[PDB]
Design an enzyme around this catalytic site. Structure first.
Site, PDB file in Angstrom:
ATOM      1  N   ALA A   8      38.377  26.872  47.046  1.00 28.53           N
ATOM      2  CA  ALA A   8      37.657  25.611  47.055  1.00 28.53           C
ATOM      3  C   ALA A   8      36.401  25.642  47.909  1.00 28.53           C
ATOM      4  O   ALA A   8      35.675  24.636  47.950  1.00 28.53           O
ATOM      5  CB  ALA A   8      38.587  24.488  47.515  1.00 28.53           C
ATOM      6  N   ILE A  12      30.841  26.948  42.700  1.00 30.99           N
ATOM      7  CA  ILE A  12      31.289  26.072  41.623  1.00 30.99           C
ATOM      8  C   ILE A  12      32.335  25.089  42.127  1.00 30.99           C
ATOM      9  O   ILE A  12      32.318  23.889  41.788  1.00 30.99           O
ATOM     10  CB  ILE A  12      31.828  26.915  40.455  1.00 30.99           C
ATOM     11  CG1 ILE A  12      30.690  27.679  39.780  1.00 30.99           C
ATOM     12  CG2 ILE A  12      32.543  26.035  39.461  1.00 30.99           C
ATOM     13  CD1 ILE A  12      31.134  28.713  38.774  1.00 30.99           C
ATOM     14  N   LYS A  36      36.910  27.636  57.680  1.00 33.88           N
ATOM     15  CA  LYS A  36      36.290  27.180  56.419  1.00 33.88           C
ATOM     16  C   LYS A  36      36.816  25.777  56.122  1.00 33.88           C
ATOM     17  O   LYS A  36      36.033  24.925  55.827  1.00 33.88           O
ATOM     18  CB  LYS A  36      36.562  28.183  55.301  1.00 33.88           C
ATOM     19  CG  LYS A  36      35.767  29.471  55.440  1.00 33.88           C
ATOM     20  CD  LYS A  36      35.960  30.468  54.304  1.00 33.88           C
ATOM     21  CE  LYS A  36      34.971  31.617  54.328  1.00 33.88           C
ATOM     22  NZ  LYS A  36      35.618  32.934  54.133  1.00 33.88           N
ATOM     23  N   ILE A  57      44.308  35.873  47.697  1.00 35.84           N
ATOM     24  CA  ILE A  57      45.070  35.536  46.501  1.00 35.84           C
ATOM     25  C   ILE A  57      45.814  36.743  45.928  1.00 35.84           C
ATOM     26  O   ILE A  57      46.752  36.569  45.140  1.00 35.84           O
ATOM     27  CB  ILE A  57      44.156  34.901  45.421  1.00 35.84           C
ATOM     28  CG1 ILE A  57      43.110  35.913  45.000  1.00 35.84           C
ATOM     29  CG2 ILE A  57      43.558  33.605  45.941  1.00 35.84           C
ATOM     30  CD1 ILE A  57      42.096  35.343  43.975  1.00 35.84           C
ATOM     31  N   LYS A 168      37.791  39.538  35.002  1.00 35.22           N
ATOM     32  CA  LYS A 168      37.914  38.236  34.354  1.00 35.22           C
ATOM     33  C   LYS A 168      38.693  38.346  33.039  1.00 35.22           C
ATOM     34  O   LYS A 168      39.547  37.496  32.727  1.00 35.22           O
ATOM     35  CB  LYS A 168      36.514  37.662  34.118  1.00 35.22           C
ATOM     36  CG  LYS A 168      35.681  37.457  35.357  1.00 35.22           C
ATOM     37  CD  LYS A 168      36.314  36.506  36.370  1.00 35.22           C
ATOM     38  CE  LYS A 168      36.421  35.068  35.839  1.00 35.22           C
ATOM     39  NZ  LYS A 168      37.138  34.180  36.790  1.00 35.22           N
TER      40      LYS A 168
END
Ligand code: NAP
Length: 342
Positions: A8, A12, A36, A57, A168
């Site tokens: 987050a 974007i 952060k 992650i 991706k």
């Protein structure tokens, strides 16, 4: 009715969080560190926003603790965390593994702690899982929402950009495989968003720094380049405005028509020189402080590379995308204004 959004702190995602808060959602973001999170909380100053810390992650069951604490209240998930780092030196560890494991981790956390609670997952994929990188300039290729990057694990690591595009592609394939294999056990419906190169202002003016996120640093670097820099005028890629991307992600969990869709977000071809041309046209008083204008671009000769058939996406989303000139103008203005130059 809370909304979880991974990664987050990014370019974007900060816009997606803005949109969520505009609409009075309770938002839970994940960021890598308490520093952060603290800085972000002060930026938004909104009591409906909270952050949980997910430092990596790629690590085991990285999202389980969030669903242990918040499983009951999370109705929607925006999985946006993936690395966009074209300076990566270890392509497997820094790009491909985090992209894939991040996605597996989120979906498996949902399956374990909230299989009936989470109604929708909106995942930030990329047009990189649809296009073929070495055919970006090939007008014989037409992309649509059913097209897949044919990259394999064997040829993914040709260079840093093919490896990013493979991260991706492989992450999204795992997403759809999970959905295929867990149709009856987990209730969430998936929607994937596929932006091309994302340009536009940072969500906060204070986030205009010497070096921006990778894709806006294309613009930022050209804007600060010596007047005598050689700028390419050959077709580079497709773009999309970050504000269109953010709007699409929120629609992605709201609109039933977007269930089980891949949404291809492109709105125009460009070369480096087409970006520079905006500087010179719109800020003529600064001419000489960045590379010069040249209208002999591939775009102006009707050269736009691979064809984009995203008509289905546009019809589903219904709203009009932001044109290239405005996206570049707004990016450049924010930077120059922060610098006190306009
Ligand atoms: N910009 C584009 O042109 C574009 C186009 C298509 C799709 N996308 C996708 O949109 C998403 C965000 O892109 P962006 O341009 O906004 O880049 P960004 O500004 O670099 O955002 C990346 C965010 O993900 C987090 N992240 C990356 N790797 C992580 C990891 N291993 N562990 C934990 N957090 C991690 C980052 O946190 P930290 O900074 O703290 O590491 C950051 O919050 C990504 O999924 C990207 O693939 C971007």
């Amino acid at each position: 009715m809370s909304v979880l959004i991974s990664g987050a702190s990014g370019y974007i995602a900060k816009h997606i969080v803005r949109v969520l808060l505009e609409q009075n959602y309770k938002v839970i973001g994940t960021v890598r560190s308490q520093d952060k999170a603290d800085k972000l909380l002060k930026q938004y100053n909104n009591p409906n926003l909270s952050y949980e810390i997910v430092p990596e992650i790629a690590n085991l069951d990285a999202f389980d603790d969030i669903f242990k604490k918040h499983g009951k209240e999370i109705k929607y998930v925006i999985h946006a965390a993936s690395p966009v780092n074209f300076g990566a030196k270890d392509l497997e560890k820094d790009l491909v593994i985090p992209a894939i494991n991040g996605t597996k981790n989120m979906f498996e956390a949902i399956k374990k702690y909230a299989p009936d609670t989470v109604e929708r997952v909106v995942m930030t994929a990329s047009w990189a899982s649809i296009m073929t990188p070495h055919r970006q300039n090939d007008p014989t290729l037409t992309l649509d929402e059913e097209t897949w990057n044919p990259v394999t694990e064997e040829n993914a690591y040709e260079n840093v950009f093919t490896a990013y595009c493979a991260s991706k592609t492989f992450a999204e394939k795992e997403a759809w495989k999970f959905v295929k294999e867990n149709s009856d056990a987990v209730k969430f419906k998936l929607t994937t968003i596929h932006p091309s190169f994302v340009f536009g202002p940072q969500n906060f003016d204070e986030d205009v720094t010497k070096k921006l996120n990778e894709t806006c640093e294309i613009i930022n670097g050209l804007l600060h380049a010596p007047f005598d820099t050689k700028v390419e005028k050959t077709h580079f890629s497709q773009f999309i405005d970050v504000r269109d991307v953010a709007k699409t992600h929120v629609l992605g969990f709201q609109k039933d028509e977007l269930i089980n869709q891949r949404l291809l977000l492109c709105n125009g071809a460009f070369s480096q020189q087409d970006i520079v041309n905006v500087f010179n046209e719109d800020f003529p008083e600064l001419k000489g402080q960045f590379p010069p204008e040249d209208k002999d671009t591939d775009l102006n000769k009707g050269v736009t590379g691979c064809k984009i058939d995203n008509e289905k996406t546009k019809k589903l989303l219904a709203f009009e995308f932001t044109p290239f000139h405005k996206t570049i103008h707004d990016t450049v203005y924010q930077i120059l204004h922060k610098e006190g130059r306009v």
